[PDB]
Amino acid sequence: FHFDAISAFENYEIEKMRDGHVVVTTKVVNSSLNYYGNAHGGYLFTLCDQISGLVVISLGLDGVTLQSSINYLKAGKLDDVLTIKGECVHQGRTTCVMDVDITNQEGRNVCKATFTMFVTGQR
Amino acid sequence: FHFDAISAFENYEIEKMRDGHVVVTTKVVNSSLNYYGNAHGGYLFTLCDQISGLVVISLGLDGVTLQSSINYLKAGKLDDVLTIKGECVHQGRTTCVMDVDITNQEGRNVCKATFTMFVTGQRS
Amino acid sequence: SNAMKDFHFDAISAFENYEIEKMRDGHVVVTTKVVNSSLNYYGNAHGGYLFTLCDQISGLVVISLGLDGVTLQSSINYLKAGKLDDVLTIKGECVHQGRTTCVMDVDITNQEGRNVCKATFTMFVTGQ
Amino acid sequence: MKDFHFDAISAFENYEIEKMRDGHVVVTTKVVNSSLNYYGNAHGGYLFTLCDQISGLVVISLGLDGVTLQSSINYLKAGKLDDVLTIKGECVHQGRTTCVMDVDITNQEGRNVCKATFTMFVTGQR
Ligand SMILES: CC(C)(COP(=O)(O)OP(=O)(O)OC[C@H]1O[C@@H](n2cnc3c(N)ncnc32)[C@H](O)[C@@H]1OP(=O)(O)O)[C@@H](O)C(=O)NCCC(=O)NCCS
Numbered sequence: 099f100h101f102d103a104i105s106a107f108e109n110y111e112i113e114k115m116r117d118g119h120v121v122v123t124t125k126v127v128n129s130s131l132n133y134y135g136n137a138h139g140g141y142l143f144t145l146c147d148q149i150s151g152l153v154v155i156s157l158g159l160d161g162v163t164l165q166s167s168i169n170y171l172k173a174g175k176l177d178d179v180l181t182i183k184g185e186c187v188h189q190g191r192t193t194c195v196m197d198v199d200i201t202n203q204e205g206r207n208v209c210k211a212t213f214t215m216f217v218t219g220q221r
Numbered sequence: 222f223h224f225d226a227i228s229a230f231e232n233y234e235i236e237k238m239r240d241g242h243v244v245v246t247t248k249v250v251n252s253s254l255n256y257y258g259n260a261h262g263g264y265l266f267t268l269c270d271q272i273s274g275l276v277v278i279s280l281g282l283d284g285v286t287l288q289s290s291i292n293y294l295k296a297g298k299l300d301d302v303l304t305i306k307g308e309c310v311h312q313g314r315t316t317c318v319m320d321v322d323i324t325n326q327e328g329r330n331v332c333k334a335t336f337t338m339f340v341t342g343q344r345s
Numbered sequence: 346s347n348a349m350k351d352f353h354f355d356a357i358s359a360f361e362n363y364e365i366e367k368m369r370d371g372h373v374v375v376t377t378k379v380v381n382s383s384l385n386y387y388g389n390a391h392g393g394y395l396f397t398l399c400d401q402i403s404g405l406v407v408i409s410l411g412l413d414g415v416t417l418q419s420s421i422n423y424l425k426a427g428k429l430d431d432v433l434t435i436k437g438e439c440v441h442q443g444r445t446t447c448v449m450d451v452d453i454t455n456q457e458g459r460n461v462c463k464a465t466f467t468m469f470v471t472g473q
Numbered sequence: 474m475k476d477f478h479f480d481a482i483s484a485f486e487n488y489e490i491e492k493m494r495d496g497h498v499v500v501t502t503k504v505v506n507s508s509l510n511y512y513g514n515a516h517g518g519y520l521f522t523l524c525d526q527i528s529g530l531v532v533i534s535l536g537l538d539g540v541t542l543q544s545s546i547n548y549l550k551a552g553k554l555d556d557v558l559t560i561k562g563e564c565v566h567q568g569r570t571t572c573v574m575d576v577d578i579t580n581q582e583g584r585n586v587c588k589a590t591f592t593m594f595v596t597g598q599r
């Protein structure tokens with residue numbers, strides 16, 4: 099039983115990365131898709147996780163993902179332009195909590211995630 | 222600020238895939254890694270999500286990921302061989318719930334996830 | 346709110362006190378005061394109490410949308426301890442209303458405006 | 474174990490610790506009327522609290538002090554009056570700063586009732 103490799107961030111644009119606020123855009127391509135021809139769940143999550151890490155960095159911190167929860171609201175499609183917005187909603191000494199949401203070019207919600215990040219040091 | 226693309230399943234072996242139980246192994250490679258040289262969180266999640274889909278298919282169903290929660294317990298390292306075990310723990314009328322575990326070659330727990338899948342149909 | 350007497354039944358299991366400040370179209374605001382029965386052995390609002398607050402308000406969001414539904418999954422982050430006599434504001438909002446699923450965000454903040462806890466509920470819609 | 478028993482009797486009308494050894498805990502309880510919602514099903518908060526407290530017990534059995542940082546729960550099948558629930562907690566990761574517990578609740582017919590994961594922040598030894 100064969101299935102294709104899943105790649106994330108073969109293209110992206112960082113529109114914003116400042117003080118706990120991150121906006122990144124990307125276009126869904128063939129390497130983003132699952133066997134059903136929709137944006138893979140792992141692809142969408144990876145978008146959110148990377149943007150969460152980007153938020154961490156924008157706070158001048160180094161950290162690792164400790165825990166995450168994600169809801170998939172609307173399918174992502176080939177050639178969709180996805181906007182990934184990440185923001186810190188709580189900054190603690192050892193943990194941070196980030197909200198990350200993805201919307202498509204028509205402004206429709208694709209997925210929504212919450213990340214608990216473990217602070218591992220200071221940039 | 223530049224960062225590399227993250228790839229998943231550039232290599233894998235399906236050891237088991239039958240009746241709601243799936244076992245897949247894979248090797249952590251350079252495309253698996255984040256900027257710190259550890260297995261990317263999205264990579265690990267993708268391993269879990271894909272094996273969850275594999276569980277759905279092994280039950281003779283087609284489905285979509287509705288919700289997922291994941292805990293990252295121990296870092297995945299370059300050249301680690303990861304074993305991904307997924308099993309259905311509840312089959313509802315339109316939804317299924319999968320437990321997925323990733324352990325390394327040393328038998329240490331790497332991460333643990335729960336997936337709520339939406340059943341979209343019945344396979345042929 | 347005789348129209349939601351079921352809530353008022355379950356609420357007297359989860360609140361020794363509460364006030365609904367807002368309840369309209371997927372947006373709910375409820376306040377409550379932390380009491381002794383809310384506390385664990387160490388004097389903090391125990392996780393089950395806070396979770397139950399969020400769950401109850403999530404049910405309220407569902408009702409405010411005119412729906413019947415069942416919780417499939419829930420996630421909660423604990424940010425700051427709740428203390429005796431704290432006044433907690435529990436805000437619920439629908440972030441996705443589908444015909445088959447709903448997703449609710451519930452946030453709890455204290456009288457000082459600090460984040461107490463943050464939760465998400467994944468619900469299966471069962472009716473009107 | 475004064476803290477666990479205060480919290481357990483303050484939240485539950487009955488419980489039994491059947492097993493408690495080194496990150497593995499088993500507790501049973503019988504669903505009573507106070508456990509039920511207006512429609513006669515076990516409250517989501519009741520089930521969650523069962524899981525959270527058993528998670529705290531797992532922490533204790535490891536000889537640690539900690540606080541719940543994050544939790545996820547999946548509701549699989551409704552709990553009913555007179556059901557006997559078996560709540561099993563297992564540590565799947567004991568870290569220096571965090572612990573992760575897997576908690577499963579099954580009923581007397583062996584059916585999965587709910588499944589939860591708890592992320593605990595370790596605050597000390599105990
Ligand atoms: C799971 C899901 C179908 C639930 O549907 P919902 O809560 O009712 O939301 P909506 O009412 O807005 O419906 C959205 C789409 O799903 C369809 N749909 C809704 N309920 C459905 C159901 N019970 N059965 C089959 N299709 C359904 C709708 O017809 C609609 O189709 P459209 O794209 O042509 O408009 C929806 O949330 C979803 O598609 N999430 C994205 C899943 C995903 O991308 N996972 C990652 C890849 S596996």
Ligand SMILES: CC(C)(COP(=O)(O)OP(=O)(O)OC[C@H]1O[C@@H](n2cnc3c(N)ncnc32)[C@H](O)[C@@H]1OP(=O)(O)O)[C@@H](O)C(=O)NCCC(=O)NCCS
Pocket residue numbers: 161162163164192216217218255259260261262293294295296297567568569570571572
């Ligand atoms: C999140 C995490 C660091 C929590 O730490 P923990 O519960 O104490 O677990 P451990 O005791 O086994 O420690 C693991 C590492 O984290 C370090 N660490 C633990 N607590 C720390 C703390 N308060 N501050 C800084 N570092 C800490 C440890 O020193 C150790 O580092 P090392 O392997 O280089 O020696 C750990 O669970 C983990 O590494 N999870 C996987 C993270 C991941 O892979 N995310 C996806 C990629 S971003």
